[PDB]
Structure formats: C-alpha cells, structure tokens
Curated annotation (Swiss-Prot), chains A, B:
Gene from which the chain derives: EDN1
Disulfide linkage: 3-17, 5-13
Record's protein name: Endothelin-1
Length: 18, 18
C-alpha cells in the first residue's frame, strides 16, 4: 500500500492508499 | 492526520495524508 488510512470508512483514502 | 505514508519522500502522499 501507498499509505494506511486513519478511517477504513474513508473510501477516497482507501482508494488512494491502495 | 488522514493517513500514514509508506514513504515520506512521496510528496503527493504527504499532501493527501497530512
């Protein structure tokens, strides 16, 4: 992964980080 | 912060995550 999201419900973060 | 970056050299990750 590019990063680990603080909130797993933060879908844009999940998409960015994966 | 929004997320934790795998590399702090990855500046777009820093800007998105911080």
């Amino acid at each position: 992964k590019r990063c680990s999201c603080s909130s797993l419900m933060d879908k844009e973060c999940v998409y960015f980080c994966h």
